[PDB]
Design a protein around this ligand. Structure first.
Ligand SMILES: *[C@@H]1O[C@H](CO)[C@@H](O[C@@H]2O[C@H](CO)[C@@H](O)[C@H](O)[C@H]2NC(C)=O)[C@H](O)[C@H]1NC(C)=O
Ligand SMILES: *[C@@H]1O[C@H](CO)[C@@H](O[C@@H]2O[C@H](CO)[C@@H](O)[C@H](O)[C@H]2NC(C)=O)[C@H](O)[C@H]1NC(C)=O
Ligand SMILES: *[C@@H]1O[C@H](CO)[C@@H](O[C@@H]2O[C@H](CO)[C@@H](O)[C@H](O)[C@H]2NC(C)=O)[C@H](O)[C@H]1NC(C)=O
Ligand SMILES: *[C@@H]1O[C@H](CO)[C@@H](O[C@@H]2O[C@H](CO)[C@@H](O)[C@H](O)[C@H]2NC(C)=O)[C@H](O)[C@H]1NC(C)=O
Lengths: 415, 415
């Protein structure tokens, strides 16, 4: 219709059945000379009236296409790195999902000058301009309910972008959701040390040393403590947590490649094998001159200048209007952006209409209703845990993730 | 040979292949008129020289046959409650395992007077007499290395029995192992509250209420606190933990039967269907007049008089001789007898030759070496966690459980 015909995905390799929905792959113009690769998957049910949902993966420097192919896209890449299988828990069953590779240099995204050194403020402005370009390319979606969603470092990307979107009346912003998100370095660092001890990863001798060198009375500082022995003890905590063979993204999952002598314990071979196939790149309208696809761009991460230490001000600004529904959800077995840091963060916002913490349920067919996690609700904001899920909630618990997503989009209770 | 021919298991129903090892099912004489049902499975490799391992399940009132058929026996009951499949991680691959239904009234065990009201001291003495009877019936096993092992409430059964066995020079006692064991009510109750908060089951409002009503400075009393509001808050913790739809035996597992409107969240139908088959009872030499088999005898539990509050004195008595190797192992996702309570307990014994806490590894074939948990070692005693396992460690992590068991029997490092 008004959509760009040039960006249409005709026949995607590895799919045994043709999609019932239209899908597009092309470029959105960011700031300066930045060209951000998008993959837009229309809703499987009523795309014309379904909400538009932006999805951003974190890093910084990691690809949102991993969110499509391994987390909640319409089809997921199989271990052969060739076959795609339909996802019965796809977020596009009820939404027009826009997967954006951002910032420039991530995956198939690029710049004419190839200068990928960026920062939080530049990324937010470039994402805003890319969203404006999306609405110029797909004007039929301008009035649809808009939701901004993401994972991990997108805990910074999403609220900063939402603050820019809020100032634009033409965008129908209705809410935002952040999965295992970085909301406060201080809250994340402090909660992680407690998480590690209480999940049986630190011994009583190390815990005693941490209490004596990092703490004073009933308050611990595991964030910016200057005490030299506290720093040494925290280096040991960091070694046990992420550099000893434990999977930082899911404590109870195995470490891909085994305990050492792609980030540690992960394996991105399937998605990389699929996206690096020349026929897949052609099907996705990727210019031939672009370098190989990687799940995370090491150089974007290395050159990235982190600016914000907390999203407290951003969330308070977004809640001030009382126009948006906010969700922070965390898999409770993740150690990268643990659930407690985000629960502490949401509680610290001190919002009105505080509800008692309750379990939230998911029906698992014949197995009946099961506790999928816990919900702590306030006016216009809720914090949720996903019991037994790691860093990538839709990968570990796809039915619970879809159920939560459906309740979020429809502004329904999470219970 | 010198073994009782009358107790031989000829053809066990549900097995597609005949066992390569000899197995027996009969009765051991306990104290008074008590007859304890045993199921003895000889080692699959060199039964004549392999150690004799007693296995006791807890409750009190629960059957050790559930340990055989669902945890670490040579064959495990399938969901149809008819088929038995060989267990490649069976503890009898390297040991002569004696599964004893104890005390009287549990499973197929009984008394001539049918009076099942008992206590810790009577149970220990009856188990000792039953062990003496085992050696009279199987004199060929008198000189074999003897290990006393068990789970949950057997955290009391095993050390109390071991104190009696230690006084008998004719029994070749070499060690004892307790899985997710009750070692101290105080340590278990205190650690559970911390476990619940740090696993995201209690909200900040409830945690604040618990800190104000149960704690004074840097010490919390969640065990025997007389404060009325502390009791009310702890009743809420107990409700969330075990009476709200969470599986107390494995936090990340579903609740069998679903979230409510056999103990809660468990399902013993397969083992019960199998053991209640009249041909199975005949094959196991069970007298026809005995009542139906149940996984846990509700009446034995109801009438049971708990006497010991801590196993501190028993373990110190057992360690005094320096003749026995002791192991306390806990699945770290169990909430019934959580890992922290037992780690605190082992550390509180204040033994010599304290080693730095380290991860212990298991090779998962092509997946390589993986962290199976953590080991805290002292002279003659080690505490181990089994990462991602619940209350029944061999059911949840059979390869890790076998590996740990092999290292324990052979007095090898756990790493
Ligand atoms: C990393 O992931 C790749 C991709 O899934 C794994 O390779 C696959 O291994 C299976 C089993 O051997 C094969 O059936 C697939 O055909 C392989 N796919 C590809 C693209 O080669 C690989 O084994 C994983 N590596 C580790 C260390 O976990
Ligand atoms: C974040 O990145 C932006 C974009 O590069 C920086 O802003 C530019 O800074 C240069 C050098 O001072 C100027 O020449 C440009 O005109 C600026 N552009 C804009 C849009 O302001 C910004 O300084 C960076 N922030 C930090 C703190 O490093
Ligand atoms: C409790 O356990 C029993 C025994 O495993 C379950 O019954 C089995 O269910 C499967 C699937 O429907 C059948 O294939 C088996 O033949 C059944 N076995 C028996 C002995 O009936 C039962 O579904 C479980 N109940 C709950 C609520 O989890
Ligand atoms: C634990 O159980 C034993 C066994 O029943 C109790 O000991 C018996 O107590 C009765 C009543 O006082 C005496 O008639 C028996 O002679 C005792 N038997 C033995 C072997 O001592 C014992 O009192 C119970 N302990 C507690 C604290 O209840």
């Amino acid at each position: 219709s008004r959509a760009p015909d040039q960006d249409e995905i005709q026949r995607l390799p590895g799919l045994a059945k043709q999609p019932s929905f239209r899908q597009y792959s092309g470029y959105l113009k960011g700031s300066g000379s930045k060209h951000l690769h998008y993959w837009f998957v229309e809703s499987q049910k009523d795309p014309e009236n379904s909400p538009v949902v932006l999805w951003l993966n974190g890093g910084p420097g990691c690809s949102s296409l991993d969110g499509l192919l391994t987390e909640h896209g319409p089809f997921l890449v199989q271990p052969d790195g060739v076959t795609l299988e339909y996802n019965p828990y796809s977020w596009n069953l009820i939404a027009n999902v826009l997967y954006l590779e951002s910032p420039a240099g991530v995956g198939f995204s690029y710049s004419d000058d190839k200068f990928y050194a960026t920062n939080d403020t530049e990324v937010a402005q470039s994402n805003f301009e890319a969203l404006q370009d999306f609405f110029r390319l797909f004007p039929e979606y301008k009035n649809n309910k808009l939701f901004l969603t993401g994972e991990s470092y997108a805990g910074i990307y999403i609220p900063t972008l939402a603050v820019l979107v809020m100032q634009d009346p033409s965008m129908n912003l209705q809410g935002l959701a952040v999965g295992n998100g970085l909301s406060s370095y201080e809250q994340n660092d402090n909660s992680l040390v407690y998480f590690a001890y209480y999940h049986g990863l630190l011994g009583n001798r190390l815990w005693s040393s941490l209490q004596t060198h990092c703490c004073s009375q009933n308050k611990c500082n595991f964030y910016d403590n200057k005490d030299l022995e506290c720093v040494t003890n925290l280096q040991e905590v960091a070694r046990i947590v992420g550099n000893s063979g434990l999977n930082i993204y899911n404590l109870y999952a195995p470490c891909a490649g085994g305990v050492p002598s792609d980030p540690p314990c992960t394996n991105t071979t399937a998605a990389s094998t699929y996206l690096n196939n020349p026929y897949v790149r052609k099907a996705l309208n990727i210019p031939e001159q672009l370098p190989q696809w990687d799940m995370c761009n090491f150089l974007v991460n290395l050159q990235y200048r982190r600016l914000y230490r907390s999203m407290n001000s951003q969330y308070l600004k977004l809640l001030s209007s009382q126009k948006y529904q906010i969700l922070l959800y965390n898999g409770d077995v993740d150690m990268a952006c643990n659930f407690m840091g985000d629960e502490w963060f949401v509680d610290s916002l001190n919002q009105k209409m505080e509800v008692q913490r309750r379990p939230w349920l998911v029906k698992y067919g014949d197995s009946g209703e099961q506790i999928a996690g816990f919900v702590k609700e306030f006016s216009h904001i809720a914090f949720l845990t996903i019991k037994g899920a790691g860093h990538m909630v839709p990968t570990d618990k796809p039915l619970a993730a879809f159920t939560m997503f459906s309740r979020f989009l429809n502004k329904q209770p999470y219970e």
